[PDB]
Amino acid sequence: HPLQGKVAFVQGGSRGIGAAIVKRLASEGAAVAFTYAASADRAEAVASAVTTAGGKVLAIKADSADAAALQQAVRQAVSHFGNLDILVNNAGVLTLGGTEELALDDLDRMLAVNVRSVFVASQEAARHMNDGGRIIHIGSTNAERVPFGGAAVYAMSKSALVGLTKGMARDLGPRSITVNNVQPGPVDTEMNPDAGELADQLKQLMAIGRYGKDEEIAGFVAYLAGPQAGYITGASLSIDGGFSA
Amino acid sequence: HPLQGKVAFVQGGSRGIGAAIVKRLASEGAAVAFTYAASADRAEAVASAVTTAGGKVLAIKADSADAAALQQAVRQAVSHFGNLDILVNNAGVLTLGGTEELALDDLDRMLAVNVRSVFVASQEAARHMNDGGRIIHIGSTNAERVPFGGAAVYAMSKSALVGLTKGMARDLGPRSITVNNVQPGPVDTEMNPDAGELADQLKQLMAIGRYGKDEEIAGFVAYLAGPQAGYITGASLSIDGGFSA
Amino acid sequence: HPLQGKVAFVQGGSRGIGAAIVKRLASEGAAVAFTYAASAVTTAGGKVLAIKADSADAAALQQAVRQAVSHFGNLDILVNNAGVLTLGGTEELALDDLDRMLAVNVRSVFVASQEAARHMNDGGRIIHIGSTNAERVPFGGAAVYAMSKSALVGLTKGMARDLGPRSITVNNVQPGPVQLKQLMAIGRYGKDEEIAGFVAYLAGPQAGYITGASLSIDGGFSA
Amino acid sequence: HPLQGKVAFVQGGSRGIGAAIVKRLASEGAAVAFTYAASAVTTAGGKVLAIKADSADAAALQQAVRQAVSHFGNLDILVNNAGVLTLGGTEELALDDLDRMLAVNVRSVFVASQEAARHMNDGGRIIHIGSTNAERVPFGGAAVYAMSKSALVGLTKGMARDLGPRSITVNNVQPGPVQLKQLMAIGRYGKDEEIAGFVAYLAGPQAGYITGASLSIDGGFSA
Ligand SMILES: NC(=O)c1ccc[n+]([C@@H]2O[C@H](COP(=O)([O-])OP(=O)(O)OC[C@H]3O[C@@H](n4cnc5c(N)ncnc54)[C@H](OP(=O)(O)O)[C@@H]3O)[C@@H](O)[C@H]2O)c1
Ligand SMILES: NC(=O)c1ccc[n+]([C@@H]2O[C@H](COP(=O)([O-])OP(=O)(O)OC[C@H]3O[C@@H](n4cnc5c(N)ncnc54)[C@H](OP(=O)(O)O)[C@@H]3O)[C@@H](O)[C@H]2O)c1
């Protein structure tokens, strides 16, 4: 239990990678607060995986596009569990569209969730975080390799986290708080399943030749959130089966 | 006159690097349309440097924070000069603030100008651009090196252009349109003068030991906008006196 | 003990980060052979073998790998931790120091990696120990050292492609320090054990999806 | 003729990109010495000197630089364009091909750069010709080539620090090609003249503020 007595906040915790990160942090001993936007039933099942195995959880309905709601969620977590040790920013939106075609709505909405809300949550968490804490952003290997058309705005929104991570590391390093950007490649989830022509296309660009599992992203996040990782900061850390080699 | 007969649009053309880029493009033969937000007198002086030396210019008042106004400006340019060959996105806002302190207003406003409006202008220009065109974003060496606190949001907004540039290059490469991100280091302007303690601090991080000149950034932009640069695309290209070495 | 049944080879394992790596991998149940600088030492019933080999000597490295495999069977893990740092300006550095840094920091990395890959199980791990000087070189005197460490970026990327069909991962761990303090975001040096913890994470069963990556553990030196 | 009065040395100047570089620098008014592979050729009244030297031979490179300086005075510009590409998997590459790629692509870059820097004017330019394979290695067989070219990243960064007090810039131009087509954003190969145009821009009076940079000219191969 390397996270015994720690408090973690996970933005986007109810499905896919987020759900795996909540369960893993809780299995190492952290109390976990997490946000969800879409499904109370998915959130309940995550919360039950935490407690059936003896961990402490708080599920919070909060739309990551709304600045006020996110800051409110972080304060609710703090009232519930005390000051945060760990923040994981896992909210993320994807719309495909060419430069000439993408709707201005769709732009605004990737910026809101993938960028704005990462800063918004980081700022409120930082105001209620213990020294020696950990902020982990979940980015994308598309910050580094964009092999096809249609991903301009999504890649932009994920490459934004590179500079964010560097400058946050400088800001919070005097408090011994680490800040890192985890950059996954394709991960097998319901909305991006390891099945079909697109997945084969993507697997051809990878050195490993399978999609990543949620548990593997979770494992890396947990390592970074842990007592062994106090010297890793400002880094963008690829976990992508060699997609970006 | 390597740009004879070309048409260029410069977002933020009335002062500093933007003014130097307008004059240089026009000196190589391009017709230049440029936007300004602040000062009609600065815009008039740029427009006069273009025409006194025999070039063609259109100055457009347009706030880069306003999506509609920017798209309108690009269409006004097109009505005036015909289809664009060259777009330069040089709008840029800077507020210093720590992660824990930065006002949410100030966040929203760097995102609006440094990120959103770069895409907005690129999209409208692309819809009215000739094959074999050129899109040049003006980023920052702070995408790569953030040596002090207080720059988290500014660095984020400039590292955003890395992924934007990569995915735009993929989108527009079939049309033989190049897309590149020029990343300057400190450049001597009125609001960031090469004088005082801050400049000395910054010069100590540089291999060259002076600030860059507007004309030097302009020279590089013009090279990239030219007939020799059709094979440079998707790149983030540092011009920073070794700030990021 | 997630490495029970596994075999590791550590190029440069007798002091500092190397020693910490050997100690951590052995504590997780690995058998470990390591080089330091034909002679070797071990313990009856123990699973740690110390082999004297200079990392500039191709023959001695290749032999060391083969001795490891003789004792323990195919490798699962290789860690390349040999390293030489000589400061010198471009105008002044002796060609002998150039050649030493190239031999140890670059050549021997490829030599060990090839020999290990000829005797490694599918699902294996190769971890190079690079440096944050590959990305940020803030002072003079480091040109050839930085060169030698930035070489590992390209190597890691191409080796990950080569070996990915065998499910072998290949990663480059880039430490910072283990005048500079103004550059460090967290205001201390790294501990050998910290570097070792990251190596052991990558060497283990949870890291099969991390490959081709250069991964910085440098207190924010390169931010 | 922005290089009138200037002196350039081009390591590997007899064919393709090297030839185009020599041709462009001379057209801008530079005196140009170049190597190709003690013998040399020139024209009476001309300012282009062709010197036979193998880039793996330290002595011959150092001599070539000194011959250039004998003819033309201190250098203003050096372009390092020698290059060897041998394909081979990690498990199979011959150590001789490793050593050849290390000698030519890495060692000789440092050797020429040091000798040039001992005989160069303040305000000078050093341009290494690297490869986009430093950043993206999409297929197997390129590990050692990629290694050799990613080495230039660190070298460029440290040399720019070393030489910045003398106002000498140091940059690494990374070409892509001059199966792959699916990787290219613009759908053609680059022309030798294009690479040369970029080199000449960096070599010139407008580029004094570009230093330490790795600058990609690769049709979007690495995007
Ligand atoms: N292939 C991949 O799956 C892959 C690759 C690279 C990077 N990533 C990154 O990994 C992260 C997690 O995505 P995933 O792959 O597990 O995708 P997913 O299963 O489709 O779920 C996306 C996650 O983001 C949350 N989210 C999105 N918009 C939100 C909003 N407005 N408010 C609150 N939460 C919101 C979702 O919660 P609700 O459903 O409750 O709204 C959900 O937990 C994202 O940042 C993503 O870009 C994923
Ligand atoms: N040290 C440096 O100077 C430096 C270093 C790295 C990167 N850069 C980048 O270079 C670019 C140019 O800046 P500069 O250094 O020449 O700075 P500057 O002299 O202070 O001017 C900033 C430019 O951005 C324009 N701008 C800002 N907000 C705008 C808005 N809402 N609408 C329209 N135009 C707007 C300005 O036009 P108006 O005044 O008419 O509003 C002006 O031309 C920016 O993207 C900047 O981040 C500069």
Numbering used by the authors:
A (entry chain A), B (entry chain A): 5 to 249
C (entry chain B), D (entry chain B): 5 to 41, 51 to 191, 205 to 249
What does the literature reporting this entry say, word for word?
We have previously identified an SDR from Serratia marcescens BCRC 10948 (SmSDR) that was able to convert 1-(3-hydroxyphenyl)-2-(methylamino) ethanone (HPMAE) into (R)-PE.
In addition, we obtained the F98LF202L·NADPH complex crystal using the soaking method. Thus, the replacement of the bulky aromatic chain with a shorter side chain at the region of residue 98 greatly led to the loss of the hydrophobic contacts between two arms. Unlike the conformational change altered in the β-ketoacyl-ACP reductase from E. coli, SmSDR reveals hardly any conformational change upon NADPH binding, providing a stable configuration of the cofactor-binding-site framework for catalysis. The other crucial H-bond with the 2′-phosphate group of the nicotinamide ribose structure is from the conserved basic arginine located at the end of the glycine motif (Ser18Arg19 in SmSDR; Ser17Arg18 in SeOACPR). Analysis of the NADPH-liganded structures between SmSDR and SeOACPR shows that the 2′-phosphate group of the nicotinamide-ribose points toward loopβ2–α2.
